[PDB]
Every structure is written in C-alpha cells, then in structure tokens.
Symmetry: D3
C-alpha cells in the first residue's frame, strides 16, 4: 500500500523514522510530503528527504496516512492543502495513524467530532474541545484512526496500525 | 500592583523578559511562579529565578497575570493549581496578558467562551474551538484580557497592558 | 523621534530587543544600523533585520542613539564610520543610551573624558582609563548620556532614557 | 525472548530506539545494559533508561543480543564484562543483531574470524582485519548473526532479526 | 619542510590546531588537505581553511604527514586518493605523525603490519588486527612513525615529531 | 621553569591549551589558577582541571605567567588577588605572555603604561588608554612582555615566549 506522511521541519524524529521503517518492513511504499522539495530536519537533528510537496499530493493516489508529532503539525495545520489531504483521507475511512501533536492536523480538518482517541497529553483539552472522547492510553483504535501519545508508545502504535493496512 | 507570571522551562525568552522589565519600570512588583524553586531557562538560553511555586500561590494576593509563550504553557496547562490560578484571576476580571502559546493555559481554565483575542496563529483553531472570536491583530483588548501573537508584537502588547494596571 | 541603534552580530539579544520595543511603544521610529544589510543574530540566536549600513547613516537625520552590549561593540568600535556617528551624535548633546559593553563605542569615539556613567563592571577599568567617573549603579544619567550595566538593569535604563526623548 | 542491548552514552539514537520498539511489538522483553544504572543519552539527545549494569548481567538469563551503533561501542568494547557477555552469547549461537559501529564489540570479543557480515563502511577494513567476509548489503544473515550498516537499513535489519527470534 | 595534514569535518580541534601551530613555529610550511576547498569544522566548532583537495596532492612534493583524530579519519579512510597519499608517504619512510583515530587511515593504507605504535585506546583492537604492536604510552616513535593516543599527549606527540623534521 | 596561567570559565580554548602543551614540551611545570578548584570550561567546550585558586597563589613561587584570552579575562580582572599576582610578576620583570583579551588583566594591574605590545584588535583603544604603544603585529616582545592578538598568531606567540624561559 502507498502510505503518505504529512510533516515538516521540527518533526519529532523517532515518530517519523519509526513508522517509516516499520511500514517499509511490510513492503509498503512510504512517501514523505512537506511544504517544499529537498530535506527537512527533526527537532533532534535527523534529516529526511522530502518525496513530494503538499501541492503535488492527490489523496486519491494514497491508501493510508501517518501524522508524526513534534512542532511540525502546528505549521502543517495552517496549510490549506495539507489539511485538505488529511480531511479527505480521514473522512473516506482510510487508515490514519497519529501520535503526539500529530492530531492537531485532524483538529484543523474538522473530522474528529465524536471520535475516540489520544494525543500528547499537553493538547488533550484541545482534542476535547474538537469533540474527541480523549483517552489516556498508549494506543487507541477507533475504526480507521489509530492514535498514540508519545515516543514510549511507538511499539503499540504501529502494532495496531500495521493490522489496519493488511 | 503585584503582577504574577505563570511559566516554566522553555518559555520564549523575550516574551517573559520584556513584560518583566516593562512593568518594573512602572513600579509594579513582578513575581515569577513555576513548578519548582530555583531557575528556569528559556528556549534561547536566558535564565530567570523562580520567586515562588504554583502551590504557594494565593491568587487573591496578586492583582494581574502575565502568560508568556514558548513550549512552557503546554507544561503549565497540565498543572491543576496553575490552571486554577489563571481561572480565578481571569474570571474575577483582573488584568491578564497573554502572548503566543500563553493562552493555552486560559483554554485549559475554560474561561474563553465568547471572548475575543489572539494567539500564536498555529493554535488559532484551538482558540476557536475554545469559543474565542479569534482576530489576526498585533494586540487585542477584550475587557481585562490583552492578547498578542508573536515577539514582533511586544511593543503593542505591553502598551495596552500597562494601561489596565493604572 | 528617530532613534538609531549601532550594533552587529553577537549583540546581547535582550539589550537590543528591549529598547527597540520600548521606544516603539512611545511612537518613536527605530532604525538598526550595522555593517551590512539583511539581518544580524544575537548571542542567544534572536535575529533582527538591519535597516541601514553605517556608510549610509547621516547622523544629522537621527535624534537619538542606542548602544546595546554583547560582543558586537568590539566589532563596531573598529569601524571608523560607526565611531564617527557615535562621536557626532554624542558631542552634539543628542540623547545616547548605552548598556553593558555598549560604551566601548563611546570610548573609541573619544567623547567620555570627564563624563559620569556606568557599564558592564568587567570593563570599568577601560571606562576609567578613558576618563569616565565610573559609578556602580543600575542607571546613571549624565546630561544626554544614560548608561546601565547589565540586563537586570533594563527596566531602569529605559525608564530614564524615555524621559529624554520627550 | 529476553533481549539484551549493550550500549552507552552517544549511542546512535534510532539504532537503539527502533529495535527496542520493534522487538517490544512482538512481545519480547527488552533490557538496556550499560556502565551505570541511570540514564544514557544518544548522539542526537534522546534519553533512555538503563535497566541494569554490565556487572549485573548473567548472559544465561538472556536469549538474544542487540548491539546498536554510534560512538558507544568504542566505550563498551573496552569493558571486559560487556565484551564477555557478547563473547558468550555470540559463541553459544544465540541471536545477535549488530548495526553500524556495533560489531566493534564483536571484533573485541574475538568471535568474528571466518564469519560473514557487514558494518558501517567506515570500519569495513577493521572488520576485514578481524577476519570477516565483509559484504556491502543492507542486511546479512550469517547463522545467528544479523548485521546491517546504517540507519537507512533499519527496516531490513529487524525484518531478518525478528524472523530469527520467532 | 612542507607538512601535509589529511583531515575532514569533525576533526578533533586541538589535534589539528596544535601541530599546525607547533610546526609553523619551526618555520615549516603547513598544508591542510581535505575533500573540498573552503572550510572544515571541528567537533568543538573551530573552523579551518582547506589549502588543497586530496586529488590535487602529489605526495612527492611533501616531506611530512600529520593525521589528526576525531570522526574525520573514518571519512578520510574511505577516500582512495587520501589513503594512497598516506600509503606512499609512510612506506617511503617520510615522517608521519598520528594521534587518536588518526591511524585508521594508516590501517586502511595497509602499512602498519609489524610496526609499533599507539592510538586512541578505543581502537586498539583494530590496530592489533592490522598487525601493530600496540603500546599504552603517551608517545611512541617507531622509525618514521610518531604516534600518540589523546589530546592530553599533545606535548609529547609534537616533542618527538619536531625532532624528525629538524 | 614554573609557569602560572590565570584563567576562568569561557577562556578561548586553544589560547590556553596551546601554550599549556607547548611549555610542557620544554619540561616546564604548568599550573592553572582560577577562582575555585575543579574544572573550568572554554568557549568551545574543552574542560581543563584547575591546579590552584588565586587565593593560594604565592607569586614568589612562580617564574612566569601566561594570560590566555576569551571572555575569562573580564572575570579574572575583577578579582583583586588575581590582579595582584599579575601586578607583582609583571613588575618584577618575570616573563609574561598575553594574547587576545589576556592583557585586560595587565590593564587592571596598572603595569602597561609606556610599554609596547598588542592584543585583540577590538580592545586596541583600551590598551592605548592604558598607556600602551599598540602595534598591529602577530607577536611583540617588549622586555619581559610577549604579546599577540588572535589564535592565528599562536605559533609566533610561543616561539618568542619560549626564548624568555632559558
Ligand atoms: Tb517555515
Ligand atoms: Tb520538568
Ligand atoms: Tb563464504
Ligand atoms: Tb530473508
Ligand atoms: Tb615553500
């Protein structure tokens, strides 16, 4: 399956790199989308190559979406095209993986009312104000939406997401 | 007046240091409250001494509140006592200045329904979901609440706040 | 009034940013002059846009001068044109504010013999050798010259300087 | 299976964190051993809790071994006890995963002469002088020894190691 | 004499800067060779100008060779041209000074079998597997090869090397 | 000969480490004096062990003095005891080496009037106001006083200083 990552500079490094390799292990094709072509750099200094820009993404051409955390979601969520990609893929029922600040993009997409999930605890009140039934758990699976809180949850996060992709 | 600051490590340096000196110029007494006693350090490496801990704060002892930005508000907003201080002071109509990510504390206090103000634009959707009429302006004055977005707004932010303390 | 700042890379961030916003609050027009156009970066990583170069400054066009600290004054003081600007404005009796290492530029201008003021204590012997009557105080006002020592003095420094620009 | 990691400060962050979560997804119990029982920090600044010291490790109590890279192996490989653990576990035919500089520990254990594998290319001549048949491949499986070169190989590295732990 | 330095980014700063100045004191001409022209930066942030690239070195026109440490030798040792410079100069009996990880270049040149020297202790097993009679001493002089371990040995390292160039 | 170094935190790393090793090469005993015992850290992060405090220094017990640069001299020179050590050793005609900001300590000692030397060019005017005949040269030898400007001058600085210690 073709898996799309929506991210930007100051992504939480392991929250991108871990699902990237975990999904490649399964044989899935992984694509990193950001504002511009070239490279992006994580909070801790890992550099990743951008495969395509948000403007060049056709969400019809992707089967699943991953939203890492860090400070990147606060910039991604102000990009109308990035938010539209997340809005369309999530509302169509495609698998969507979010961790940490990742679901700020889903908040901006307006797709979380009545949905059950988790996030970085520091934004739980924003999740609740967006209509989420917020849970303090290492992983939540609510239909197509697999959500986790922090890097310590990575093992459980992708354990559940990988099931959704097969 | 006695002005309280609710903050923590990874505060945006100038958003704390600027109002601190600006209100000292007026002869106001300025107090930095945080989790623990000792020093806190900004994103850019400035160190400031903590005057008292959140547990030791009596909100009735303080006349006004400043909420700087940075990553600090996401840690402050998970502290029940800090959120209670902001809840009490804001709902009593005492002057409250927020800038950047500062109003995340006010979101968690549940006091912004029907209010008008601004923030860091990256969290405008969270402000809107908290019931704020969000404005893209360098400074907004809504009764007791003076709000600004970023460090470039500092001059206008405290220009309006000092007016409420005199 | 039109207020000129003579500075360069490795300026002490708050010593430039604080008076910049404080004087904008009053409605003064603030201009940052440096070696080259573009931007300069402080010791702590804050970036500020340069409005004009030393070579394009006509001191007659400006009403007041601010000399922040950091390691920038040791670069500025070797620029003949920057030193000439400070020499002319100071000797004409225009308001001049200095803090920390800022007065090293005034030492190189040859205008401090017989004047009273302060600076970072680490350079008090250089101030004294230039003929300054050095005082250990948070702010000194000697006619047109307002001087302070360290960032902890910011509130008193601009409290006195703002009075001269009225 | 109980999986032991031999590491230290300045480990390559993703080379430790990735297999840690990947093996944890399978339900394996993962243990981090180092010089002292507190916290170790990677080259990029991620912190991980040390479960036990090398002195407290009984290799008989562990089923498999992971050797991440970074600058850490050059410290670990000078510890008699750490090298002894790797020597026993490898010579007993237990599964051993190494990546990047990790096999420097196995070079010091004297167990690689006649074996086939890979490493960070920068140390291929050391691997060859240790008697390794060095291969430029993303992953090599030589009986119990699964070896990879760099972080880009993570997906293939643990794809093969997990298969050996089934 | 003309002295050549083979180095790259992430050189150990003092291990390059110390012999560079120490040999200039004697009147020797010092040349820094690396991958590209411009500047290289040490682990601690000192910047050094590159005089020539590896491809433009003729080893017949240099009398001596210095191999500093840091992470740079692991990059240099994968450059065929850099390795053949070291191979030719060392086997011709020209004076060669190495410290710390510096001799990794000599390992890759295949010139150390039967020779006596030292290095960073972390790579002593690689030196031994290359056929070195490894010694734990602050400086070793083995004919044309002067070797030291760590920055604390700088004084003894160049004390011996300077004798070979007089 | 016994050589004393007067320094502190934020010393310029190579300006301390270079003469330290260079004088040890000659067989001189080198002592690092600072405010407190333990370690000091340079601008670029090198750590050095303090041998004695300024309070336990008896200047009769030392034959020569080295004053490295960095931001350390501005701290040292406010210490009455450290300045007294430099005053006594310099006025007794003992060899004194200074580089960069190093001579700020000699300015505070009041011993430079009518002397000839150099320094970091950023403090030329302070040297001149102290009564120095300032020269723009890589090294100046004025009887017992050997002075240089910047790290690029290290080779010439100690080339001349070493000659005074016979
Ligand atoms: Tb951007
Ligand atoms: Tb904390
Ligand atoms: Tb074979
Ligand atoms: Tb296979
Ligand atoms: Tb020549």
């Amino acid at each position: 399956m073709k898996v799309l990552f929506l991210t930007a500079n100051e992504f939480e490094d392991v929250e991108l790199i871990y699902p990237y390799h975990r999904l490649k292990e399964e044989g899935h094709e992984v694509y990193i989308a950001s504002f511009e072509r070239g490279t992006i750099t994580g909070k801790h200094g890992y550099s990743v190559k951008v495969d395509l820009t948000f403007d060049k993404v056709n969400p019809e051409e992707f089967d699943a979406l991953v939203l890492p955390g860090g400070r990147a979601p606060e910039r991604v969520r102000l990009n109308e095209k990035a938010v539209s990609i997340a809005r369309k893929m999530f509302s169509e029922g495609k698998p969507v993986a979010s961790i940490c600040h990742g679901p700020q993009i889903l908040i901006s997409a307006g797709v979380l009312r009545g949905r059950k999930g988790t996030s970085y605890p520091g934004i739980k009140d924003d999740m609740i104000n967006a209509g989420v039934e917020w849970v303090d758990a290492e992983v939540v699976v609510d239909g197509n939406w697999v959500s986790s809180r922090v890097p310590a949850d990575l093992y459980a996060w992708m354990r559940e997401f990988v099931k959704l992709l097969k």
